[PDB]
Amino acid sequence: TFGAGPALQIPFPMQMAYRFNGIGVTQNVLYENQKLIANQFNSAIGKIQ
Amino acid sequence: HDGKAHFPREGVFVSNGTHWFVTQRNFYEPQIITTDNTFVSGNCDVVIGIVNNTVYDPLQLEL
Ligand SMILES: *[C@@H]1O[C@H](CO)[C@@H](O[C@@H]2O[C@H](CO)[C@@H](O)[C@H](O)[C@H]2NC(C)=O)[C@H](O)[C@H]1NC(C)=O
Ligand SMILES: *[C@@H]1O[C@H](CO)[C@@H](O[C@@H]2O[C@H](CO)[C@@H](O)[C@H](O)[C@H]2NC(C)=O)[C@H](O)[C@H]1NC(C)=O
Ligand SMILES: *[C@@H]1O[C@H](CO)[C@@H](O)[C@H](O)[C@H]1NC(C)=O
């Protein structure tokens, strides 16, 4: 939202549900796997270093 | 509502302090939460941040 006008706040877990709906996956996939997805992101970030 | 978790078909759930609505994301047009605005997926014990509220059923309100 901040690249197209004012910066409108939004919780990050709800932001990712927007981005899951953008790839054709429903948003109940994220909320019901939120802890797994959080752990996959943290592990994938730590492997970059 | 009634042990089931309801997610919006398209939009967000918002509250004006007291009441809960479902609106589109890019423009504030609040609407009453019905079974046509939302879809059910699973139970309430798995989503982090779920809130109790009333989801109105158009069919059960007539039959
Ligand atoms: C989807 O894949 C993930 C990642 O491999 C699976 O989560 C792992 O599950 C195993 C046990 O099967 C655990 O030992 C790992 O710690 C889990 N990984 C993480 C990052 O939490 C998950 O089970 C799979 N989902 C399925 C098969 O339904
Ligand atoms: C949140 O929105 C609801 C729905 O529009 C408001 O409820 C109405 O409030 C007005 C003004 O107080 C009353 O005249 C109406 O009778 C109320 N309608 C119903 C169905 O109760 C509510 O006041 C709003 N809350 C806040 C804090 O602004
Ligand atoms: C309302 O929500 C709480 C958690 O905030 C839950 O423990 C409780 O069972 C819910 N009550 C009803 C009537 O569903």
Side-chain angles (χ1 to χ4, degrees), chain A residues 17 20-21 25-31, chain B residues 7-9 11 25 39:
Chain A
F20 267 54
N21 284 109
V25 192
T26 59
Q27 54 186 335
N28 66 283
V29 169
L30 176 64
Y31 295 121
Chain B
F7 308 86
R9 282 179 182 170
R25 306 164 181 171
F39 67 88

Side-chain angles (χ1 to χ4, degrees), chain A residues 1-3 6-21 27 30-31 34, chain B residues 8 11-14 23-26:
Chain A
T1 61
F2 79 107
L8 315 162
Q9 78 251 33
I10 187 177
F12 196 90
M14 295 189 55
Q15 167 182 174
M16 288 294 299
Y18 284 10
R19 302 180 172 270
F20 267 54
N21 284 109
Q27 54 186 335
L30 176 64
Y31 295 121
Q34 180 179 339
Chain B
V12 265
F13 290 138
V14 295
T23 169
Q24 45 168 338
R25 306 164 181 171
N26 273 347

Side-chain angles (χ1 to χ4, degrees), chain B residues 11-35 37-40 42 44 46-58:
Chain B
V12 265
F13 290 138
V14 295
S15 176
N16 68 331
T18 74
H19 299 7
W20 281 94
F21 303 111
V22 44
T23 169
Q24 45 168 338
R25 306 164 181 171
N26 273 347
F27 193 89
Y28 182 61
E29 264 199 6
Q31 285 182 329
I32 285 184
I33 302 174
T34 73
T35 66
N37 295 333
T38 68
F39 67 88
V40 185
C44 309
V46 73
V47 184
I48 310 174
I50 196 167
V51 303
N52 308 337
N53 197 256
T54 312
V55 173
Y56 302 96
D57 195 339

